[PDB]
Amino acid sequence: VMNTIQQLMMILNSASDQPSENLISYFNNCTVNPKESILKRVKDIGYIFKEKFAKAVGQGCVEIGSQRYKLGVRLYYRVMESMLKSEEERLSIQNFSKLLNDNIFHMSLLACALEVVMATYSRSTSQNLDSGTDLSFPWILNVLNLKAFDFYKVIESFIKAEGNLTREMIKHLERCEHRIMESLA
């Protein structure tokens, strides 16, 4: 008895698939409104992710792959919002058109959100379960085709932005960081 779920996954499980009203407010406050492109990338990548998940995972776990993608997308919106708030407090600016219309910030942020979920192995990569396959780093970088160094650029702030991140998840992301470092020089 006694739930083993941890806080962030708990929050995530009950989160919504769409960006919050508060988040949409940040979109509407931009010189060039990022909504359309942001929703398109999420949807376009949702497909690459699912076909890749299937190709690495195998027969009918499609349900799994979809939920894994959903959880990552939710953390992504949760963290974007979170960074926006802290940046507005830091700069006293509320129009983040450049940041939000930037593909890399988005690809980077989404990869990291999906990385934390994929490393969490939500229900848990096991010796039998569906997605008992380990799909942690550099998996995501390859599925989104994202530069290791770009991915690296979002880590620190993703961690600063996500307080409900477990210590094991923080050490994971710091590990990916270390690895990308040694892959640099």
From Swiss-Prot:
Dephosphorylated at the late M phase. SV40 large T antigen, HPV E7 and adenovirus E1A bind to the underphosphorylated, active form of pRb. N-terminus is methylated by METTL11A/NTM1. Expressed in the retina. Expressed in foreskin keratinocytes (at protein level). Coiled coil: none annotated. Residues 1-185 are annotated as: Domain A. Tumor suppressor that is a key regulator of the G1/S transition of the cell cycle. The hypophosphorylated form binds transcription regulators of the E2F family, preventing transcription of E2F-responsive genes. Both physically blocks E2Fs transactivating domain and recruits chromatin-modifying enzymes that actively repress transcription. Cyclin and CDK-dependent phosphorylation of RB1 induces its dissociation from E2Fs, thereby activating transcription of E2F responsive genes and triggering entry into S phase. The hypophosphorylated form interacts with and sequesters the E2F1 transcription factor, thereby inhibiting E2F1 transcription. Interacts with heterodimeric E2F/DP transcription factor complexes containing TFDP1 and either E2F1, E2F3, E2F4 or E2F5, or TFDP2 and E2F4. Interacts (when hyperphosphorylated and hypophosphorylated) with PKP3; the interaction inhibits RB1 interaction with and repression of the transcription factor E2F1, potentially via sequestering RB1 to the cytoplasm. The unphosphorylated form interacts with EID1, ARID3B, KDM5A, SUV39H1, MJD2A/JHDM3A and THOC1. (Microbial infection) Interacts with adenovirus E1A protein. The Pocket domain binds to the threonine-phosphorylated domain C, thereby preventing interaction with heterodimeric E2F/DP transcription factor complexes. Belongs to the retinoblastoma protein (RB) family. This is Retinoblastoma-associated protein. It comes from Homo sapiens. The gene is RB1. The chain holds residues 378 to 562 of 928 of the full protein.
